[PDB]
Amino acid sequence: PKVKAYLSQGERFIKWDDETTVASPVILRVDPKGYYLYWTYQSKEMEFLDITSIRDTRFGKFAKMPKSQKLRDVFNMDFPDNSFLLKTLTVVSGPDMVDLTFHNFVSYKENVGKAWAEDVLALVKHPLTANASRSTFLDKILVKLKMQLNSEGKIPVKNFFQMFPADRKRVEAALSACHLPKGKNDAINPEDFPEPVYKSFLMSLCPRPEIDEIFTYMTKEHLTKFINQKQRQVQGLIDKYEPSLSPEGMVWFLCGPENSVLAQDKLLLHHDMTQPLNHYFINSSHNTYLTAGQFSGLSSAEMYRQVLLSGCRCVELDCWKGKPPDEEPIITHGFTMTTDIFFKEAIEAIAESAFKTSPYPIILSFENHVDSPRQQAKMAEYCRTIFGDMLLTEPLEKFPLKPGVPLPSPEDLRGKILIKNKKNNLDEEEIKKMQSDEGTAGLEVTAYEEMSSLVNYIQPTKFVSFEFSAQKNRSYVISSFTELKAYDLLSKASVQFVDYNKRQMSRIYPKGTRMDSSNYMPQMFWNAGCQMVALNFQTMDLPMQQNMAVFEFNGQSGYLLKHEFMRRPDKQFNPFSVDRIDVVVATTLSITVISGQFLSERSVRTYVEVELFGLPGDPKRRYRTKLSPSTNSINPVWKEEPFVFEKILMPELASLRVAVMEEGNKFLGHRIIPINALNSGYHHLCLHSESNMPLTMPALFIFLEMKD
């Protein structure tokens, strides 16, 4: 995705901060490679923001507004017919959904911020941007080093120490090996640090003798043999990667884009999007308005923006009456100490962000406690007016709400918002039981005409039995279960649950005892064909690590087509009891964890954990490498046998977790990858954060092999 020329040429803005009240003129740019959004002050200083760190961009009325009187005067915000809203730009960045930074800009020229917002987000959100080769992430480092210059236009040696902080002596030695100065207060001409010199620097700092071991120099014939035998035109690869094929040439080849750990086409939108809505796994958030714990902490409408921007397609609104003297509907976790937001604010947030990154339909799960015709009427009017044409207010002509009629497809409902709401306890012991399980979901109130009229394809009803649901044969009825109730059902009525999910929707949500907003592991519910397995997006624990990872695929649309046997009515499937037909494309996966590079910002021992998520009958062994030989985190090499996952039964449903840890089990980076997206051979596995964001420094070198 090429960086448009105007972005690299730059535009004039005033950058402002509310906490400091400082407003400074800047030129804003994206570098030609699209690694950094950066701004340059009049005094020549620069600040950089990784493109991969950007979560959203906002223009006009959606941008952040200056709150201090000092800044309001500067921007003439107390004036009739001012052009301030034609000048505002906000860039939102952060390592997860909650820890957000707002970078705020006001353009000198009118209207330019719209293009900046749209084009920058397009670069950030392209499924391939985060999935570049190891070489690209290494290049990102080089570009930073060469752009962050001192007063004399030179690279301070201290910037090398900051970039590679684990071992100063080794950095000094690598600079010296390149005939560059290594003095603490020395500086380097950027002209003396082109790509080949950078490569030499890396080879000195981070030697790769484990790659030299594959040479058992290469010619055309020998390298062709390697590519055809191990990795599952050759002279052109030598010309591209050989510095003078040498060991170093092989290093760069193996770090290059010709070698991809993923079948990258699978990151793009590519699933059949024309099947009934309930034939997909749907990315789903629980108690979306909460930023932290379930019992206390801030509620924020910003959570709706954040989850929707990551392709979440099902969110939750817990609606309550205003607290007298207030008479305006609010969103909060009832009977707790969580803060309140206005219902209106949530609708405004959803309307803004709903289709920015995915065009496919969203479902709003209302948990309604507003036992007021007036306040329900306000709720319904907010939805109708703010969502406008986005709101699905009536069923589609092709899909009437009658027995035997399937749900419409994601494609049939492109750009539509669907409302899930009802459509037309007392003592200490009972309270405790409810709090431990369904929580406030056990306390919903009757819907009146205004709210009822908005409900069509997602009608919640009390579950009776799978037999009863099958008899009634209504695809437009949804059943919701706590993790506890659904576990009881999937354990005791597995086949019936899968069959239910071929016709109707189920939504799963965390039990009430999880007051710290911990998550349950989603796999067992996906295994039963459950579509909306709702998790707390503010908690990037293992469940969310998996959720973010698997939903990155299919364009981060928030929809993944379920396995054929979870869809077609003529093949009964039981995830606990596979048959001959189920296992037709079973595979055995071997992964060898060979070595790691720049794994930590400090010298500490490290190890790698590997496991598989999948069916009950899938291989359950969890592997760990030994600790690294020493506290060397620059280039540890392990001496491990392949980790074998024998008979992955239905690879489409399985994912491989590879997680890198410091001694003590402190997270450094990970990947969770659907089995069918993996390429075989020697690869440099670039590591992601808990929230699946690409990390620049750390990588693993691995060998993958798959057999029938």
Ligand SMILES: [Ca+2]
């Ligand atoms: Ca709720």
